[PDB]
Amino acid sequence: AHPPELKKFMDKKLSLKLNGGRHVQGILRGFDPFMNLVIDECVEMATSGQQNNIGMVVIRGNSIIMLEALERV
Amino acid sequence: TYQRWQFTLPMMSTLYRLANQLLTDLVDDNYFYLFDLKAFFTSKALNMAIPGGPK
Amino acid sequence: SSKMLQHIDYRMRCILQDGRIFIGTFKAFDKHMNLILCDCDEFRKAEREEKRVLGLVLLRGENLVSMTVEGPPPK
Amino acid sequence: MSIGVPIKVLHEAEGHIVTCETNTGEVYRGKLIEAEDNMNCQMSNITVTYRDGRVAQLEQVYIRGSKIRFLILPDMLKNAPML
Amino acid sequence: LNPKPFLNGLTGKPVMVKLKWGMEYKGYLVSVDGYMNMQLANTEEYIDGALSGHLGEVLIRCNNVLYIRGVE
Amino acid sequence: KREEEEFNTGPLSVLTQSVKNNTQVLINCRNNKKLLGRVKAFDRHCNMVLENVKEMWTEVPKSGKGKKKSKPVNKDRYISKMFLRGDSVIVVLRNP
Amino acid sequence: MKLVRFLMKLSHETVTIELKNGTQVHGTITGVDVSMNTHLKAVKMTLKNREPVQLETLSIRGNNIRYFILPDSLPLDTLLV
Amino acid sequence: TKKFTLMEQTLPVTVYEMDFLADLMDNSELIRNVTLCGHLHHGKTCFVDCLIEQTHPEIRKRYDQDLCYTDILFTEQERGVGIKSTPVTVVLPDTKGKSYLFNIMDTPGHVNFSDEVTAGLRISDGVVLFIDAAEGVMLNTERLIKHAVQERLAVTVCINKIDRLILELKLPPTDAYYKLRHIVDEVNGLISMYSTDENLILSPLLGNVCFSSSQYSICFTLGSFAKIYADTFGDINYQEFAKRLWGDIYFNPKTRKFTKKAPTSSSQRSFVEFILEPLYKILAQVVGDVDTSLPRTLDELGIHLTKEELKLNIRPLLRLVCKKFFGEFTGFVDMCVQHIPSPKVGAKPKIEHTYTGGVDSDLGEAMSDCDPDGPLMCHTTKMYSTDDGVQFHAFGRVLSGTIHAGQPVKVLGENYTLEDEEDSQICTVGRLWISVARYHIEVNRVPAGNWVLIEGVDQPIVKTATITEPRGNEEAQIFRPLKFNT
Amino acid sequence: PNVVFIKTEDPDLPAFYFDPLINPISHRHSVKSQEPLPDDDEEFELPEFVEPFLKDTPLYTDNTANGIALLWAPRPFNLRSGRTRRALDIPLVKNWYREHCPAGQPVKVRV
Amino acid sequence: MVQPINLIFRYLQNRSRIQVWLYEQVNMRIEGCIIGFDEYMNLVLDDAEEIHSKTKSRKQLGRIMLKGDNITLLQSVSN
Ligand SMILES: Nc1nc2c(ncn2[C@@H]2O[C@H](COP(=O)(O)OP(=O)(O)OP(=O)(O)O)[C@@H](O)[C@H]2O)c(=O)[nH]1
Structure with a gap:
């Protein structure tokens, strides 16, 4: 079927690497057929390593180019 | 030349029960356990008889 | 289809979107122009020039620009 | 439906060791686990080469389909009953 | 205000469309459609805010378009 | 048939009248260059079949690292008939 | 309408094409497909700045194309049907 | 001439390249080692035939007579009772098309021969259990469940001879459903009684039981049948469908969703309405109206037969019609692949049970990793005589390391210990073969995880023996001799 | 087997029916198991x-009841097609003497 | 499970002030209050202040519609 087999990764702690050289790290709970993610406890990794905290975020599917686990399935 | 025959199943299903007086209604070959052709051969290769078999 | 199918099992030269070149023996293609190249070389350009080797390369269709023949078949 | 020969060879590739290069220029080298019909791969136990030289090891990774621009499938597959 | 009613609203007003490549147009829009292509009338083109010229009766093609904003 | 209702009414009507009147129309490609044309047919993807065309741009390649910018005075080469893949389009004018 | 079908009737005439990445081919055409996939034979290349090349047959993916360059040897009027 | 066995001189045509098979053998996660066991004449051998017939295009059954492929002995064919555990190695595809290597140890089902099961059980990772649908559980079915579970293999069960319901007993669908469900429940009861684990409950929803008729080449899981369903109509998430096709789930045709409660008193179950009833309608047309309405029916199924095929007798014709409908036995693969662990994963329980030194030993750790480049540790459990009867070939599992042609190996007999080395001998390994029941493929080497026939090591071996490097693994020990069922 | x-x-009876000779299936799930049946209305529709x-x-059709019965008919009657034999070769009475007939018959015939 | 088309609806009902990051153009962000989704994730942002971070200054726009393919994240911030 069309959904990504992302079911494994849920509630484990992800890093993402986003289009345009951006990085965010997250505990995950969402996916839909386009891979639109809903990330929780989401940190923004700025260029300089000055880190922000931000709340729950949606991501557009096409913006992702990798999706990595910081703590295992 | 009358070599080959090919019948539909309503034909066969009739012919079977016309013949029914001659045929025996054994559904499976378990009956002939020591009463088949192979068993008699053993009774002929040895010198020793099956009770109802030929001699 | 029928024009592409003529090429099969030959030794094909592909030019990718970024400017790279692959040269490979060609045995698959698909409605999105995916490819499987086989026994394959990665090749880049006195102006310096270089030749790297790759195996059984599976090319996602988006990258392809053009492909060309230069060999008789590896029979 | 006519999901043709290449994606079947991708499914055939699973459980081996494949190399996989993304638009940006990162080169991954990892053991495959599953691959989907749009080429979303999961990959395990990777040694990644960065665009500028550096190596790193990784636990597990999932690589969006349209973001790839070759895989290096393991050579023994040339015999496979897809071909 | 869902996006489909909204675009019917802005019909005939003044609107200012900004394209991904950093050009921008001022226009009195004339229609929109299923893919959100657009037409504009009596248009100006800004390039870093320079009034480049009165480009007559433009059409714009929908993949180019970032935000559209309405003008006081 | 149903596209005819769209192409008369909607934003594509710019192209539609451009065929009937045979006004020129100044297109702006993605490679910066402009195509000025008398569009002789089209489809919904903005594909076009152009004529009497003159493709005007400043030619300053990346090769120069400062040398090529010496050349701002432009060019105008005249392509007699020309089909154009639709996705090359960012905007289109009417000229009158 | 449906101009891609006009790009199949055009067979075995002669064309230049410029591709999107500044490539130019010069070719005689046989075969075209629903997704504009071009195949040319008797092919002369010229890359961006780099010098010409000449090739037997060249097959060009659909979405890399930009403008063709038809010959003046087309009477256009036939395309209406 | 002494040639009392039906060995084939020439290698038959296969769908797969033989080079591809050897390549797969290195990939220790792709291979599966099953054993098929279950009570007398429940249809094991004839099932295996249907795999071979699928895999070897030149080989076909005779219309009049079963092709007992693994019954290689005249003695065995004369009796009609399997007497020797005969291994078969084939690669056969999944529903996905992904090709896996199966080593299938076809075993006897007669109670006395049970020795043959236990030997093949030891080298296997998993049981497939065959039950005649008409008879259900019988004496030897219960014994083999008990034995397998004690040996810590994963178990999955296969319900054979479903055709007997339709044609012999003539049971209506709903009662036939109850006959199936009864079999499943009895097996669950037996397992849960013996096994201390509780997670191994088996039920069609979970994939690990499949329904088959081996005379007529029918095999389907719930997943497999839905794959047929989806490839017809399109746009079905077939894995989600297969969850809904068993037990007390009823279909509501007005809302077109499934519910646990029957919308009318005559609402047949999801299983009956979707699985059984179209199965029934296939068979009752073929054995019924072959003259009048069978061509019309075959149109709807998308099956086309030539005018020469349509003149076959009913038993050949029925097998043919189903073979086009179901196609490959992919359902059997899905059951085996998921539930039965690969040798990588399976190594840890296997070493723990069978090895007297246990997992705590350095060699125990090395064998658990199942490394092909590790220390050679091979276990032989069966002996098969040559075609002439002069020699015996040892058969075993390369439980670690790699065996090479011509290599000198130390063979450890069953009494060997670190305190008594007298039960050991050094032997020169001759030719190796991957074994297939009637023809043998010779190979240069066999990596860890696969089965192999070994020539010339048979002299010091009485029954079991451990094969190990003569100069490296000086602290190796034997595997425990087989604890027979009786 | x-x-x-x-x-x-x-x-007159339907070809598929639970004929009284067949022992009734006693089974009816008493200790009713709660195997992983998906929840009602959980987003699945065909x-x-x-x-x-x-x-x-x-x-079933009227021929279905008859047509099954041919499958265990003796050797010339269980097939749709064959090859014709000579009238010489068919042994019409052969099936009788191959079975051990009931002993109450006179001595003379038994031998 | 938290589906994303559900989450964005919760941001409508709060009428929150959310900050969007554009595709490729890291140096610019939009910071909108929101009502809007046809299925493409096209947003309609009322405040819509542009944040050109080299200049730090904050240029102001009308009631703008932000076409779906330009989006990346969808962060939550204060008003
Ligand atoms: N009705 C029916 N009979 C079958 C089917 N498959 C096999 N049989 C018959 O059942 C008998 C047993 O088949 P085998 O497979 O040789 O016996 P087995 O299961 O291997 O058991 P062993 O003799 O101990 O080796 C044979 O006469 C087959 O013709 C089936 O699918 N349906």
Whole structure:
């Protein structure tokens, strides 16, 4: 079927690497057929390593180019 | 030349029960356990008889 | 289809979107122009020039620009 | 439906060791686990080469389909009953 | 205000469309459609805010378009 | 048939009248260059079949690292008939 | 309408094409497909700045194309049907 | 001439390249080692035939007579009772098309021969259990469940001879459903009684039981049948469908969703309405109206037969019609692949049970990793005589390391210990073969995880023996001799 | 294995029916198990036109009851096609003497 | 499970002030209050202040519609 087999990764702690050289790290709970993610406890990794905290975020599917686990399935 | 025959199943299903007086209604070959052709051969290769078999 | 199918099992030269070149023996293609190249070389350009080797390369269709023949078949 | 020969060879590739290069220029080298019909791969136990030289090891990774621009499938597959 | 009613609203007003490549147009829009292509009338083109010229009766093609904003 | 209702009414009507009147129309490609044309047919993807065309741009390649910018005075080469893949389009004018 | 079908009737005439990445081919055409996939034979290349090349047959993916360059040897009027 | 066995001189045509098979053998996660066991004449051998017939295009059954492929002995064919555990190695595809290597140890089902099961059980990772649908559980079915579970293999069960319901007993669908469900429940009861684990409950929803008729080449899981369903109509998430096709789930045709409660008193179950009833309608047309309405029916199924095929007798014709409908036995693969662990994963329980030194030993750790480049540790459990009867070939599992042609190996007999080395001998390994029941493929080497026939090591071996490097693994020990069922 | 075929006596009955000779299935789930049946209305619905495969055609037809019975008929009657034999070769009475007839018959015939 | 088309609806009902990051153009962000989704994730942002971070200054726009393919994240911030 069309959904990504992302079911494994849920509630484990992800890093993402986003289009345009951006990085965010997250505990995950969402996916839909386009891979639109809903990330929780989401940190923004700025260029300089000055880190922000931000709340729950949606991501557009096409913006992702990798999706990595910081703590295992 | 009358070599080959090919019948539909309503034909066969009739012919079977016309013949029914001659045929025996054994559904499976378990009956002939020591009463088949192979068993008699053993009774002929040895010198020793099956009770109802030929001699 | 029928024009592409003529090429099969030959030794094909592909030019990718970024400017790279692959040269490979060609045995698959698909409605999105995916490819499987086989026994394959990665090749880049006195102006310096270089030749790297790759195996059984599976090319996602988006990258392809053009492909060309230069060999008789590896029979 | 006519999901043709290449994606079947991708499914055939699973459980081996494949190399996989993304638009940006990162080169991954990892053991495959599953691959989907749009080429979303999961990959395990990777040694990644960065665009500028550096190596790193990784636990597990999932690589969006349209973001790839070759895989290096393991050579023994040339015999496979897809071909 | 869902996006489909909204675009019917802005019909005939003044609107200012900004394209991904950093050009921008001022226009009195004339229609929109299923893919959100657009037409504009009596248009100006800004390039870093320079009034480049009165480009007559433009059409714009929908993949180019970032935000559209309405003008006081 | 149903596209005819769209192409008369909607934003594509710019192209539609451009065929009937045979006004020129100044297109702006993605490679910066402009195509000025008398569009002789089209489809919904903005594909076009152009004529009497003159493709005007400043030619300053990346090769120069400062040398090529010496050349701002432009060019105008005249392509007699020309089909154009639709996705090359960012905007289109009417000229009158 | 449906101009891609006009790009199949055009067979075995002669064309230049410029591709999107500044490539130019010069070719005689046989075969075209629903997704504009071009195949040319008797092919002369010229890359961006780099010098010409000449090739037997060249097959060009659909979405890399930009403008063709038809010959003046087309009477256009036939395309209406 | 002494040639009392039906060995084939020439290698038959296969769908797969033989080079591809050897390549797969290195990939220790792709291979599966099953054993098929279950009570007398429940249809094991004839099932295996249907795999071979699928895999070897030149080989076909005779219309009049079963092709007992693994019954290689005249003695065995004369009796009609399997007497020797005969291994078969084939690669056969999944529903996905992904090709896996199966080593299938076809075993006897007669109670006395049970020795043959236990030997093949030891080298296997998993049981497939065959039950005649008409008879259900019988004496030897219960014994083999008990034995397998004690040996810590994963178990999955296969319900054979479903055709007997339709044609012999003539049971209506709903009662036939109850006959199936009864079999499943009895097996669950037996397992849960013996096994201390509780997670191994088996039920069609979970994939690990499949329904088959081996005379007529029918095999389907719930997943497999839905794959047929989806490839017809399109746009079905077939894995989600297969969850809904068993037990007390009823279909509501007005809302077109499934519910646990029957919308009318005559609402047949999801299983009956979707699985059984179209199965029934296939068979009752073929054995019924072959003259009048069978061509019309075959149109709807998308099956086309030539005018020469349509003149076959009913038993050949029925097998043919189903073979086009179901196609490959992919359902059997899905059951085996998921539930039965690969040798990588399976190594840890296997070493723990069978090895007297246990997992705590350095060699125990090395064998658990199942490394092909590790220390050679091979276990032989069966002996098969040559075609002439002069020699015996040892058969075993390369439980670690790699065996090479011509290599000198130390063979450890069953009494060997670190305190008594007298039960050991050094032997020169001759030719190796991957074994297939009637023809043998010779190979240069066999990596860890696969089965192999070994020539010339048979002299010091009485029954079991451990094969190990003569100069490296000086602290190796034997595997425990087989604890027979009786 | 014991062929278990149940001879339908009269053609009025439906060809598939639980004939009284067959022992009734005692089983009815008493200790009712709660195996992983998905929850009701959990987002699964079929496309518009899927149906049970052969639903247009009846479960049984009048020939179905008769046609099954041929499958265990003796050797010339269980087949649709064969090859003709000579009138010499068919042994009409052969089936009788191959079975051990009931001993109450006179001595003379037994031998 | 938290589906994303559900989450964005919760941001409508709060009428929150959310900050969007554009595709490729890291140096610019939009910071909108929101009502809007046809299925493409096209947003309609009322405040819509542009944040050109080299200049730090904050240029102001009308009631703008932000076409779906330009989006990346969808962060939550204060008003
Ligand atoms: N009705 C029916 N009979 C079958 C089917 N498959 C096999 N049989 C018959 O059942 C008998 C047993 O088949 P085998 O497979 O040789 O016996 P087995 O299961 O291997 O058991 P062993 O003899 O101990 O090796 C044979 O006469 C087959 O013709 C089936 O699918 N349906």
